Amino acid sequence: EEGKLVIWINGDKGYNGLAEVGKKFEKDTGIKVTVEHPDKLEEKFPQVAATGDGPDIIFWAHDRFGGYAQSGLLAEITPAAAFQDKLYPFTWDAVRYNGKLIAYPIAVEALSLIYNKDLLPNPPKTWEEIPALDKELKAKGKSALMFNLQEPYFTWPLIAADGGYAFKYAAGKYDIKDVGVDNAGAKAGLTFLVDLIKNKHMNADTDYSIAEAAFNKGETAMTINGPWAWSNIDTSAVNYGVTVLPTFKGQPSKPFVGVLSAGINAASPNKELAKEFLENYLLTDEGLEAVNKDKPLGAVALKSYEEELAKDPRIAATMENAQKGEIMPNIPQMSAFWYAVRTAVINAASGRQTVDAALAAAQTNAAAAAQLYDVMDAVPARRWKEFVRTLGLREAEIEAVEVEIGRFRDQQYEMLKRWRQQQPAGLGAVYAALERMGLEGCVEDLRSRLQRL
Ligand SMILES: OC[C@H]1O[C@H](O[C@H]2[C@H](O)[C@@H](O)[C@@H](O)O[C@@H]2CO)[C@H](O)[C@@H](O)[C@@H]1O
């Protein structure tokens, strides 16, 4: 409410360093700033966004924000040109949706190969030598590589290496009908990983926590993680280097590059309080450093502080894997891409389906669920569950998109409920709700539009 900014950020980031920026904002303003890191906040936000229980500011990679923006869930970001010139232009590209800036870019993230120099002074240049490397390391009682296999964010670089892609980009924007998840490149990539499991070089149940504790206790020679993981490795007794990810079939693995961004809730009563903290407190040299001290940000978007961080060879390696990778689209159809790839990798890793059944299933489901967003606002009110039931698409990854779209539609009805009570609300979500509620909603919609002038 008024007199407080509640901020949502994921738990693997420096929320205590971010809180320290919230203290300094309170010493000058008296305004209290609370930072919390809820479980599944990226899925919890579309549930409580337009309600009085949503955050004022939400921190996540830029790929989740276009679904928020298209729903009208976030207020438009309009900094002065003098403030925009303080950040790199490509960071603003990642937060521009339909010509509108929708968030504040914070830092550039990219996965890197992190290795123990004591167990491995020269890291492998190719994926293909980890099998032979692991055998020599399992004789030593250890393993070669352990990383999170439960999230496709970590496994996508190998899948993308030989030619996999999410949505084909061609001349200005992406084609959601062109998904490259089961092409010859993505199959060879996922086959190599599955080959590592069946050959006893990796465990299919390895997650983030096990892979981190194994590397930080010297049990595996390598892991794959981002800049946020460096702080936990510093505290342990391992001398580590970070460098390029291995190549596959002679081509560099292409990770999905995420730009950590801060979006402002369109239903927040303290939008101006949020921009002042963001523009004049966090996005400063001493604000970024308070967070980077907690757990590192990576290549920050602030050009002044990025001069100091570019010295770090760990930052240079992050940028090298980011140029070899590709930036994530911010389109709402990314949620459909992820949900379908998570199931394909887990099913192929556990052997429940072959690499071919897994990647062909995800290809059709990701291309089918992508079209649901094109009619999310068209389906008339009270009819979304009826619409879903009629289609009969009973696939887990497709209905995960149906549920989120249903969550998006509910928040637009909350925005209309507040807007009718002269409360803070996003006008785009108000109109999106009104334009699916019959002829009287379209009269109330346009009548409103005509008084705005
Ligand atoms: O897994 C940790 C890592 O996850 C994030 O990457 C996400 C992506 O941003 C989401 O849209 C999700 O659907 O897909 C990926 C997970 O599979 C962040 O990019 C990163 O900061 C975070 O550490």
Q: Is 288 in the pocket of ligand 1 (CB under 6 A)?
A: no
Contacts 24+ apart (CB under 8 A), 433-441: 433/381, 433/409, 435/377, 436/377, 436/378, 436/379, 436/380, 436/381, 437/380, 437/381, 438/380, 438/381
Q: How far is CA 306 from CA 59, 109, 281, 357, in A?
A: 20, 13, 17, 45
Q: Are 219 and 142 in contact (CB under 8 A)?
A: yes
Ligand 1 atom nearest to CA at 334: 11
- Cα of 216 to ligand 1 centre, how many Å? 22
Tokens linked to 296: 């590192």
**Cα 256 from Cα 99, distance rounded (Å):** 22
- Amino acid at position 23, single letter: K
**Cα 276 from Cα 160, distance rounded (Å):** 40
- Cα of 61 to ligand 1 centre, how many Å? 7
Q: Are 338 and 344 in contact (CB under 8 A)?
A: no
**Cα 133 from Cα 286, distance rounded (Å):** 43
Ligand 1 atom nearest to CA at 226: 23
Candidates 371, 433, 390; CA nearest to 408 is 433
**Cα 231 from Cα 116, distance rounded (Å):** 15
Q: Is 63 in the pocket of ligand 1 (CB under 6 A)?
A: yes
- Cα of 207 to ligand 1 centre, how many Å? 14
Ligand 1 atom nearest to CA at 148: 1
- Amino acid at position 177, single letter: K
Q: Is 281 in the pocket of ligand 1 (CB under 6 A)?
A: no
**Cα 311 from Cα 142, distance rounded (Å):** 33
**Cα 65 from Cα 73, distance rounded (Å):** 9
Q: Probe ligand 1: pick from 153, 342, 346, max atoms within 8 Å of CB?
A: 153
Q: How many CB atoms lie within 10 A of CB 122?
A: 8
The sheet carrying 112-116 orders its strands as 143-145, 220-225, 112-116, 240-243
- Cα of 453 to ligand 1 centre, how many Å? 41
Candidates 315, 263, 293, 312; CA nearest to 14 is 293
Backbone phi, then psi, for 38, in 5-degree steps?
A: -75, 160
Query: Whose Cα sits closest to atom 6 in ligand 1?
Result: 153
Candidates 354, 314, 301, 261; CA nearest to 112 is 314
What angle do helix axes 355-370 and 334-350 make, rounded to 10 degrees? Answer: 160
**Cα 68 from Cα 86, distance rounded (Å):** 25
Query: Whose Cα sits closest to atom 21 in ligand 1?
Result: 61
Task: Return the H-helix or E-strand segment holding 427.
Answer: helix 427-434
**Cα 246 from Cα 347, distance rounded (Å):** 24
Query: 3-state SS of the chain: helix, strand, coil percent to 5?
Result: 50, 15, 30
**Cα 253 from Cα 127, distance rounded (Å):** 9
Say if strands 256-264 and 240-243 run parallel, antiparallel, or are unpaired: unpaired
Q: Is 109 in the pocket of ligand 1 (CB under 6 A)?
A: yes
Report the DSSP beta bridge partners of residue 174. Answer: 169
- Cα of 151 to ligand 1 centre, how many Å? 8
Report the DSSP beta bridge partners of residue 6. Answer: 34
Q: Is 149 in the pocket of ligand 1 (CB under 6 A)?
A: no
Q: Are 187 and 355 in contact (CB under 8 A)?
A: yes
Q: Are 418 and 50 in contact (CB under 8 A)?
A: yes
Q: Is 61 in the pocket of ligand 1 (CB under 6 A)?
A: yes
- Quoted resolution (Å): 2.1
Report the DSSP beta bridge partners of residue 32. Answer: 4
Q: Is 151 in the pocket of ligand 1 (CB under 6 A)?
A: yes
**Cα 277 from Cα 282, distance rounded (Å):** 6
Ligand 1 atom nearest to CA at 61: 9
Q: How many CB atoms lie within 10 A of CB 168?
A: 12
**Cα 154 from Cα 147, distance rounded (Å):** 7
Tokens linked to 90: 């490509």
CATH class of 112-256: alpha beta
Location of structure tokens 């966004």: 49
Q: Is 230 in the pocket of ligand 1 (CB under 6 A)?
A: no
DSSP 347: H
Residue by residue, what is the 3-state secondary structure of the chain? CCCEEEEECCCCCCHHHHHHHHHHHHHHHCCEEEEECCCCHHHHHHHHCCCCCCCCEEEEEHHHHHHHHHCCCECCCCCCHHHHCCECHHHHHHCEECCEECCEEEEEECCEEEEECCCCCCCCCEHHHHHHHHHHHHHCCCEEECCCCCCHHHHHHHHHHCCCEEEEECCCCEEEEEEECCCHHHHHHHHHHHHHHHCCCCCCCCCHHHHHHHHHCCCEEEEEECHHHHHHHHHCCCCEEEECCCEECCEECCCEEEEEEEEEECCCCCHHHHHHHHHHHHCCHHHHHHHHHHCCCCEECEHHHHHHHCCCHHHHHHHHHHHHCEECCCCCCHHHHHHHHHHHHHHHHHCCCCHHHHHHHHHHHHHHHHHHHHHCCCCCCCCHHHHHHHHCCCCHHHHHHHHHHHHHHHHHHHHHHHHCCCCCCCHHHHHHHHCCCHHHHHHHHHHHHHHCC
**DSSP for 65-103?**
HHHHHHTT-BPPP---HHHHTTB-HHHHHHTEETTEE-S
Ligand 1 atom nearest to CA at 260: 21
Burial of 414 (0-12, 13-18, 19+ CB in 10 A): buried
